[PDB]
Design a protein around this ligand. Sequence first.
Ligand code: FES
Lengths: 115, 154, 85, 78
Amino acid sequence: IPDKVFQPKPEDHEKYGGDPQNPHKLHIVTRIRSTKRRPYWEKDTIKMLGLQKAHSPQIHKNIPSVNAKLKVVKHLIRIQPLKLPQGLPTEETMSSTCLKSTGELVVQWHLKPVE
Amino acid sequence: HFQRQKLMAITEYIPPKPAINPRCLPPPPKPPKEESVRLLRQDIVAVFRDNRMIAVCQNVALSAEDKLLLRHQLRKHKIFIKVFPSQVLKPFLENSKYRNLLPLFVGHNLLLVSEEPKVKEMVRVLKSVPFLPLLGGCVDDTILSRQGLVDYAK
Amino acid sequence: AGGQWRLQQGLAANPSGYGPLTELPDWSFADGRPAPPMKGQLRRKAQREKLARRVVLLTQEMDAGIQAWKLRQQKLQEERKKEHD
Amino acid sequence: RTVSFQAKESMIRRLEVEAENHYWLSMPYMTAEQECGHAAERRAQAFEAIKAAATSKFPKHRYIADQLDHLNISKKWS
RNA sequence: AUUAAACCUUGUACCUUUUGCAUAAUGAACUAACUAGAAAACUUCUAACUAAAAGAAUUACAGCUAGAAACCCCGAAACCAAAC
RNA sequence: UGGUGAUAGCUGGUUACCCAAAAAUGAAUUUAAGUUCAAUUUUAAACUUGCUAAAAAAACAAAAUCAAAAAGUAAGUUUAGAUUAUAGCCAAAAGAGGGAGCUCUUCUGGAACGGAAAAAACCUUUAAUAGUGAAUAAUUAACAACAUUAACCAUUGUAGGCCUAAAAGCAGCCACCAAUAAAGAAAGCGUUCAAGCUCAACAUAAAAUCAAAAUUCCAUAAUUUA
RNA sequence: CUCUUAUCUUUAAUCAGUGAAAUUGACCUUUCAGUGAAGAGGCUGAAAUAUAAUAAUAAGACGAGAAGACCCUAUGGAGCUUA
Ligand code: FES
């Protein structure tokens, strides 16, 4: 596959809402398919990545080695950029953290409807 | 496989829909007209200018060679059967001395072109066959009927 | 059904995900004494807290790598500017 | 076998999702140089624990209490 | 399951054998009894004693003594001896 | 009758439960229903990197082999003892015999309780627990063709030269001009030969890139409320 | 035989007495088409269908069967005889 596939365009950035500068640090990956009937190399990568259970949240760094590994298993995973509206959680708030489906990890859970 | 068949359908190109079909389009500009036919203009222009009165009689399926003989027969009468295809006859009025004789030159009919006021010679031609519809002669390039021709052929 | 709409509103596609219905206690004493925390809720809290610690560690490690990267480029810079005699 | 309309849409969705994966994999936050050695310390520590655990096998001890406790089987009412 | 025995719904007898398959093929009227894994030379393990061990014959520069731990059933065509 | 429970690599049968690991390469064999050797697996011991990945450089010709550092990750090497397994099936790729299809060699995958009609081999599916909960995956159905060609007429030279009896546009054979408004020295017809049927001639019409075999039919139906 | 018919006996059917054999996984034991290995009472899809009985016929399922029949082979065995 040509490298142009992984070279983004200005329109692509708008569609996916990703800024070319300050790229997202952490990837959110969940397995949505089975590795049965797949070649051994595909099976090995999934086990190494820890995505044994489907729909299992995993925190991984957006680094070339992880990026290379994720590309191999791209079709079996969903990639979402992590967002920290309130910043990194503190030690005291480590028990109050909650990750939303939108990709935002709130450090304080107030048990109030967003509405 | 079923999945492979799905790919084939996906390759089908998606064409956009035009706003209006060509037949139902608003009247668009069309290519300019061109006079191809141009040669025939000179031939009719010269003969009509030369001959003031043009007796007219719808040809009764006459053969081409007969016209050659009739041309010589009129040469005895000092007249000529100079006729040309009628598709280029209609644009004659468009580019000629007159522009208003189009209704008179409706249909394809024999044109008897005479420049001299030899009435007896012209009528003798009429005496050959009267049954074909003889519209009349435009004496002095003026609209005349068959009876009008007689009233003004004098 | 309705998972797509729930995602559109920002809620979990499956109502059994993150929500007051699942997270909140399901009962309390008639006397008013609060009920003990649910074992599943406590179990779920532990995993969420553990994942948060991993996020902090990964970010801290990435921060160190970013700084240590620049630090390695500062050693090259000072190495270039050298003289003797 | 003519393709059902539902199947075509499902395949399109998978391709579209994979396209998003491509974009988010198109912006590596850390360059190649930064990655080198960033996790070296952690990996070294982890292997040391692995070696210690792996080489900890040995036969288990035997205690007098086990033999002596068997005599309690004869306990009865006074 | 059910208010309800039957209706509605679900479900291609068993062993053996074939390919990890039988809509193949073998065997079975049923009841009761009877009907097929057996050996310690060495090793591991459990202990006694220790440059010694073993109640004679053995082994030994940690060995030696004791204990425990193991390997089916039925069925030929035949072959030979001695009588009838 | 006894030897005799003869022998039988052959046929058949061979009686409780639970947990863990777990079959299908190379070499030789009267060998391919078995056995030995390598390789695996396995137990014990010694102590440390291993697997995936891996830039550039070569090697070849002008994504694997090799393997810096990483990274993702937890096994690996050596020593000692020891066997069992060593026969698939089908699908799908790459070749070679070949020309259908087959016959092989090599790589890849599989063993639903879901789906494709029933469906070992295809698709969705990480194990298995109770509950009259919930979100989803695959999922036998699908929605005739045309963008030069439609009306009218057909005269004269020369029946032009050619073996043709004769062949005149029209048996052969020719080159290939004129008049005319328009006539092809002829386009298909007709042809004892020609007369003769039209097509092109001129006048006058009107147009403008492929689709959706023999028992007995076999769900029933169904074009528009977002 | 054309061209079959009639009568009598045996069998047959009824009453009463006595009373086997091969066989047998269980069967609440249907038809059409499909599927499959030539192949379906038991699968797939249609159809038919009060319960229980009673009396008749042997064409086909290229019916089911045996170590039946014939010919030939073996750088197969084994046995026997030798000049
Ligand atoms: S709608 Fe038919 S030509 Fe315009």
